[PDB]
UniProtKB/Swiss-Prot annotation:
This is Dephospho-CoA kinase. It is found in: Cytoplasm. Catalyzes the phosphorylation of the 3'-hydroxyl group of dephosphocoenzyme A to form coenzyme A. PROSITE patterns: DPCK (PS51219). It comes from Aquifex aeolicus (strain VF5).
Amino acid sequence: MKRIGLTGNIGCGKSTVAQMFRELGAYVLDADKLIHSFYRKGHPVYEEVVKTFGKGILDEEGNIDRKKLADIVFKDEEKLRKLEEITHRALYKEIEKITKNLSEDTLFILEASLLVEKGTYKNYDKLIVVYAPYEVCKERAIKRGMSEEDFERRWKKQMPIEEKVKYADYVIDNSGSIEETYKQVKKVYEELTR
């Protein structure tokens, strides 16, 4: 099977596209969504993140303070490197677990919105990016509720979408309408299962 990557910026429609693609038959796995489940509790990732960063330093009665950790990790990039490791050590250890039962010739896509800057797109055959102007993305996260500063706080991290577009061999612009966005993915899905 061909490992496909679906990326973009926050509020670009990666979700809606990931969905359309699933309807078409593709198997889209939200990497980011999955990761967040690692910091829950009984999760094996949890036991490691605490085991290596502090049985309690980053704890708040029961679970882990996503702020305390992100704090003691913004000082020395040595700890972050270790954090980014445990993560992928769980992602690429769970991806093959799913690929196990996954029938062949199946269209397996992975959306993380951070396959470019994190330099991971090289781990997948082709890359798909969803374009959308800062204007549309902002109000998009707005109408969905996320607070202006919070949005801009993340958008800052992600590289200029107008530059990211120059990283994928497929760009399903999601600024126009829904009819167009879906009409595009459909074209792409055809260009992947030929």
